[PDB]
Design a protein around this nucleic acid. Structure first.
Ligand code: CL
Ligand code: CL
Ligand code: CL
Ligand code: CL
Ligand code: MN
Ligand code: MN
Ligand code: MN
Ligand code: MN
Ligand code: MN
Ligand code: MN
Ligand code: MN
Ligand code: MN
Ligand code: MN
Ligand code: MN
Ligand code: MN
Ligand code: MN
Ligand code: MN
Ligand code: MN
Ligand code: MN
Ligand code: MN
Ligand code: MN
Ligand code: MN
Ligand code: MN
Ligand code: MN
Lengths: 94, 106, 97, 84, 96, 78, 106, 93
DNA sequence: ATCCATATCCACCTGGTCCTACTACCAAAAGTGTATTTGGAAACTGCTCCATCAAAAGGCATGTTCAGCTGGATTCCAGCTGAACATGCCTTTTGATGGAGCAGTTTCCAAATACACTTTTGGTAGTAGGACCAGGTGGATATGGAT
DNA sequence: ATCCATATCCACCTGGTCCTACTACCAAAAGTGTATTTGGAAACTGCTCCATCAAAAGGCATGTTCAGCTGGAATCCAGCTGAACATGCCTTTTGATGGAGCAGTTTCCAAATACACTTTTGGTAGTAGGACCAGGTGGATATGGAT
């Protein structure tokens, strides 16, 4: 049986972080899976178009950022750009 | 040590990387792109799960169901705009009656 | 005689606007799907979740359409939705053009 | 197998009334229902087609939930909850 | 006078429906574009083709919005477009 | 600036749209709508310009921005 | 010897659309027939639009196509109007259409 | 820089269609934008097709199915016949 | 129906913005020869889940009656908004000059790929066991609406 | 403002759903380490085209007057649509089964990739010729509309 990967483990971790005494239903978790896969495809697609427009063959963190700014509305874009920058600086700091 | 721990994230950096090259969005994928993308995805999940958990608490429930995800999405202007062309299965609709449809003057 | 025309309608608006259940009976919708699909290609099978997905999408689209339509009726100073309201809505959202 | 005919009338007047109620509609004219069915027929026809176009491309005879999700997404009405 | 109200209005409906020229004066539209862009980034310059493209898309969008707006006014048994018609069109469209 | 788009111009645009009679309040609402439209489009276009590390908004930036706004435009590249 | 588009009986470049399919990051591999098919479809659609636009041009007593003629061709054909339902033809204008209730005599 | 365009090919098809008619520069650019647009649509739909079925190659079949998914009815049938015809002639060449 | 005042159109004319032909050059695009790799079609078949049946029953559709009130027709008039002028503001243009900076070129290195090994882990499945909530009840309270 | 026929709300409760929890395994995923390749940042800078004047020309926006005709308010009333009811049907639910067909696994070759090498061509760039058509003129005539 071929494995069917998903984001449910990670969605559950970030769920127990925000509301530690709150569970989630199978259907609701499925909606969360579709949400993460969806946003993933939107971001990576806008970044693909971005790299193609500027004749670059590499998708870097910068294209992901510009894609976030193009895709997410105002405040979500600001906080998402913040957390992304923080994550890549912490990553490269090692 | 995983790259997720290396970046201070719960979401899988390695999986986001392998998916980024598996979906041929470009020829090459820098090392920071899956870190940034997993970070953004994790932030969005944290946001919607916060608003939805509050929706479940308001309805005196301890388990989030699609109704709570819908209430969270459609009541947050930014999340609603982000999912403007998306329908959440079993999400229902926001209670909203146009004021003219309400009775008046006995 | 007990409730003036409109009261039970508002009661129903609150009832269904508060819940998430599907409002079209399952089996007739399944028959409709198998008919429409049978006319495109014979000898087709469906996963149960495919029919339920078509259910969800159809009812969501129809509910949103009924909201835009209700706005069309109210725009004409009417409480009653009418076919011209549906046609105005679908024409504005580029569904018919 | 028995021939399938006139199943659009299975979308009953009470069902259309419930859908309109969820839409916040208070008064419904008598000509709405038929109209609704028409619109509904145009909707399913346009998704199911694409759905089976996926099903036929994968050399399959069973329409999956994923075919419906792909068809709905390419129509612009992407649906969460059934995969993808 | 001479013509009754609404006649030369029809005349100009025909006139501007036959032609394809742009209807907003170039320079004020260019000033508007530069002012709006200044809020997002400073010391920005524009290719002329970018400004003309913005004007094509803008006037197309507005003409279509006046089509749907006029339809909204006619739905309410009226001939004069009013702000609530534009609002209804933008709400049905999914913009509002 | 936004008042530089005059009432006569808005009238001509409405006439191309087949409008016969125009309310006096239409012009302000129209200026607002146009300003929102240009704000979104120009926002995305300037995002493209900044990503390209440039200081000149090109017609292709406007074309890409318009395309992702769902309003693709023929005749200026792409 | 002979170009691939000549062997396919096409006027549109098969080799070019093949190279573009490669660089466009659409898939890891591109079969030899896909650029032939795609080039043929593009040539056909071009032939249709140019045909109807040419008919509009001769109907307007002109010999060379302007954006107005492209717009008249697209917006008067139902299927081309559906295909280009979300695109704006620059310098195209609109079709002559006055709502009937706005005409004279009430 | 070599700025590629579909100009010469579109003009040649125009000569096959209306041999005595020309085309303006802006109309030519509109035609180029249309060819590029339809190209990106069909190629993108085909890419999503190959991805949905875990395939690594875009074949003429993918292009065909994408054409059935993108183009309206009669345009879809005509375009499909044109495609299969060009592939048939190219194969027997 | 008469006919005055504009709007509109058809035939014709010409400058000029604008299209095709022709010559030259060259990087790159495209084809061809050939050698290696491999995606995925064929064949086989395990195993999921789909179509179908049966029976029981009650949730809900159907069809009817009755009348409350909503839409539509009618009428009217206050007042906005269109139509034509009179100003004269400020776009349009076009000619031309700086010079910003887009964009072509050459270096060169931090980073991405390719490959090989090793360790980790997320997913599936089998078995077993709690708990949140849907549905049901019964009474208290709240609401529409007749009086 | 009072009193009743109904709906609504809540605490309490229980079935049996929904979810969670260990054990076990492992094939895929992910990390680590070296070696090789290279995309694209940086520095330079040539030349394209963008900003800014200058400076009339007059096109067109603006303010104003007047009144036509339109939007919106006020009335009336037919018949449409909501509400309630009685009946009974066909959808929902529970359980079972054959077998179609989805999908896992292995073989194997046509077809794609990778590279070297040759040929062809489309794009740029001048320089020069040509012509379709926008804009203007006369003059005919159809048209909106007041008598
Ligand atoms: Cl990176
Ligand atoms: Cl109607
Ligand atoms: Cl208004
Ligand atoms: Cl192929
Ligand atoms: Mn049939
Ligand atoms: Mn001449
Ligand atoms: Mn293989
Ligand atoms: Mn019955
Ligand atoms: Mn009324
Ligand atoms: Mn410089
Ligand atoms: Mn584990
Ligand atoms: Mn309950
Ligand atoms: Mn009361
Ligand atoms: Mn219990
Ligand atoms: Mn290099
Ligand atoms: Mn008067
Ligand atoms: Mn009126
Ligand atoms: Mn009556
Ligand atoms: Mn019975
Ligand atoms: Mn079998
Ligand atoms: Mn050549
Ligand atoms: Mn010349
Ligand atoms: Mn002329
Ligand atoms: Mn007359």
């Amino acid at each position: 049986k071929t494995r069917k990967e998903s984001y449910a483990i990670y969605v559950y971790k970030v769920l127990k972080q925000v509301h530690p005494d709150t569970g989630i239903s199978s259907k609701a978790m499925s909606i969360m899976n579709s949400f993460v896969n969806d946003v993933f495809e939107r971001i990576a697609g806008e970044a693909s178009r971005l790299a193609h427009y500027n004749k670059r063959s590499t998708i870097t963190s910068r294209e992901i950022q510009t894609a976030v700014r193009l895709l997410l509305p105002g405040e979500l874009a600001k906080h998402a750009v913040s957390e992304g920058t923080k994550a890549v600086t912490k990553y490269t700091s090692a | 040590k995983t790259r997720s721990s290396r970046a201070g994230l719960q979401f899988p950096v390695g999986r986001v990387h392998r998916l980024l090259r598996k979906g041929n969005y470009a020829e090459r994928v820098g090392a920071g792109a899956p870190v940034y993308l997993a970070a953004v995805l994790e932030y969005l999940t944290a946001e919607i799960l916060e608003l939805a958990g509050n929706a479940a608490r308001d309805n005196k429930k301890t388990r989030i169901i699609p109704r709570h995800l819908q209430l969270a999405v459609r009541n947050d202007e930014e999340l609603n705009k982000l999912l403007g062309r998306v329908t959440i299965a079993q999400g229902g609709v926001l209670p909203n009656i146009q004021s003219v449809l309400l009775p008046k003057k006995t | 005689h007990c409730y003036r025309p409109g009261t039970v309608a508002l009661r129903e608006i609150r009832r269904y606007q508060k819940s998430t259940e599907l409002l079209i009976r399952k089996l007739p919708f399944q028959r409709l799907v198998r008919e429409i699909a049978q006319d495109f290609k014979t000898d087709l099978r469906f996963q149960s979740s495919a029919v339920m997905a078509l259910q969800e999408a159809s009812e969501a689209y129809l509910v949103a359409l009924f909201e835009d339509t209700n706005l069309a009726a109210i725009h004409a100073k009417r409480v009653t939705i009418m076919p011209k309201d549906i046609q105005l809505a679908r024409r504005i959202r580029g569904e018919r053009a | 197998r028995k021939v399938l005919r006139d199943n659009i009338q299975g979308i009953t007047k009470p069902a259309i009334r419930r859908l309109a109620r969820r839409g916040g509609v208070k008064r419904i004219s008598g000509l709405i229902y038929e109209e609704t069915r028409g619109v509904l027929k145009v909707f399913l026809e346009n998704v199911i087609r694409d759905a089976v176009t996926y099903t036929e491309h994968a050399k399959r005879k069973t329409v999956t939930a994923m075919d419906v999700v792909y068809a709905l997404k390419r129509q612009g009405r992407t649906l969460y909850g059934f995969g993808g």
